[PDB]
């Protein structure tokens, strides 16, 4: 997260860290045994870490659970990143409390101007790499579809939306991929891609979760 602030320990209880010996992506807890992340964060050997704040120190509240399976959307296209969403089922259910909690799926899509909270342990520099130990937060608005398509002509599908600041300076970045974009208490986006991080007129692009709620429900119901 570039231009963000320190969230405060466990103030984002649905945030998870995907770990394979180091933090490589974020995710969101949607029920006690399932996490939603981005399809491009897929790899084998994933351990899901819940209740984290400092990812390099065991401070208490952490729950480390291995992924039993990861389900990449069947129509995920790695070249356009269209359908960039993945579901991870945990080997055991997590103990939910006030520090580890799930986030609700939306019943409707959010509109331009909605203010959302994006969080993660990704890079904090637009020019270079500084990776934080604690969780960073950023409040950013959803942009109109015309500004998003004007910024990335021919690359935005209906399963994507832009959020951020065209002036540059505040944005999600590498390491934040797969993490949450929460607006009014509902999970509306998943950190997916962008051109560099916090560059002027190049906002972040997010997977539009309201378009996948029936797919998530049906897939969880059959697995
Ligand atoms: N500017 C952004 N909002 C952004 C967000 C997530 C990203 N993830 C990546 C990324 N970069 C290199 C390898 C994997 C990634 O997910 N770039 C990213 C850029
Ligand atoms: Ca920790
Ligand atoms: Cl277009």
């Amino acid at each position: 997260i570039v231009g963000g602030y320190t969230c405060g320990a466990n103030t984002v209880p649905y945030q998870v860290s995907l770990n394979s010996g180091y933090h490589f992506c974020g995710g969101s807890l949607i029920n006690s045994q399932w996490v939603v992340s981005a399809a491009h964060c897929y790899k084998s050997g994933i351990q899901v870490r819940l209740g984290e704040d400092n990812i390099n120190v065991v401070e208490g509240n952490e729950q480390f659970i291995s992924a039993s399976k990861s389900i990449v959307h069947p129509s995920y296209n790695s070249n356009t990143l269209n359908n960039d969403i993945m579901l991870i089922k945990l080997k055991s259910a997590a103990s939910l409390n006030s520090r580890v909690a799930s986030i609700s799926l939306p019943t409707s899509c959010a509109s331009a101007g909605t203010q959302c909270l994006i969080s993660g342990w990704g890079n904090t520099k637009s020019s270079g790499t500084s990776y934080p130990d604690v969780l960073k937060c950023l409040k950013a608005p959803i942009l109109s579809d015309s500004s998003c398509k004007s910024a990335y002509p021919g690359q935005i599908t209906s399963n994507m939306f832009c959020a951020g600041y065209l002036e540059g300076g505040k944005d999600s970045c590498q390491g934040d991929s797969g993490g949450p974009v929460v607006c009014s208490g509902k999970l509306q986006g998943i950190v997916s891609w962008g051109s560099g991080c916090a560059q002027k007129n190049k906002p972040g692009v997010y997977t539009k979760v309201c378009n996948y709620v029936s797919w998530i429900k049906q897939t969880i119901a059959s697995n």
Side-chain angles (χ1 to χ4, degrees):
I1 301 288
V2 180
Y5 55 95
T6 293
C7 307
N10 308 100
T11 48
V12 189
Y14 49 88
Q15 172 82 229
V16 318
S17 168
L18 297 188
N19 186 286
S20 46
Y22 54 101
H23 166 84
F24 63 87
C25 275
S28 297
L29 186 64
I30 51 168
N31 58 50
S32 51
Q33 218 167 337
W34 290 88
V35 164
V36 181
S37 182
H40 76 261
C41 285
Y42 175 84
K43 66 167 62 175
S44 51
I46 298 179
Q47 181 178 65
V48 176
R49 296 190 171 204
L50 304 89
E52 289 280 16
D53 184 33
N54 182 323
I55 52 164
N56 290 303
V57 173
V58 171
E59 302 175 287
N61 299 309
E62 293 97 336
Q63 286 176 54
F64 290 180
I65 306 180
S66 298
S68 36
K69 52 155 56 180
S70 304
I71 305 179
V72 165
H73 189 280
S75 303
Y76 165 59
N77 182 306
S78 47
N79 294 290
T80 60
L81 280 188
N82 185 39
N83 302 302
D84 191 14
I85 180 168
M86 161 176 82
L87 286 171
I88 302 176
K89 192 187 186 196
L90 306 184
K91 188 177 284 189
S92 36
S95 314
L96 303 179
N97 49 62
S98 41
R99 281 75 93 235
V100 177
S102 51
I103 184 64
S104 301
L105 286 179
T107 41
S108 52
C109 299
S111 46
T114 297
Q115 210 67 38
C116 306
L117 178 74
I118 306 173
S119 47
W121 291 275
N123 185 26
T124 52
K125 290 179 60 65
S126 33
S127 314
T129 47
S130 193
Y131 286 96
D133 285 320
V134 299
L135 189 67
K136 298 291 180 175
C137 283
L138 177 65
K139 284 167 170 156
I142 290 181
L143 305 185
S144 62
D145 284 327
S146 31
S147 296
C148 189
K149 290 176 166 172
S150 290
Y152 296 107
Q155 307 150 72
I156 304 299
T157 64
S158 46
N159 301 306
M160 303 174 189
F161 64 85
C162 288
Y165 303 86
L166 298 174
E167 63 262 33
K170 303 190 193 68
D171 190 14
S172 46
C173 193
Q174 152 175 76
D176 291 318
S177 285
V181 176
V182 175
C183 320
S184 307
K186 301 298 190 180
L187 182 65
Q188 295 284 182
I190 299 170
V191 179
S192 185
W193 59 280
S195 193
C197 299
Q199 294 313 310
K200 182 178 172 296
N201 296 134
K202 293 299 176 184
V205 189
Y206 303 89
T207 301
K208 193 178 184 174
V209 178
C210 63
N211 289 353
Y212 304 93
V213 180
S214 330
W215 179 71
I216 292 170
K217 290 177 174 174
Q218 296 177 334
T219 302
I220 289 181
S222 44
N223 283 280

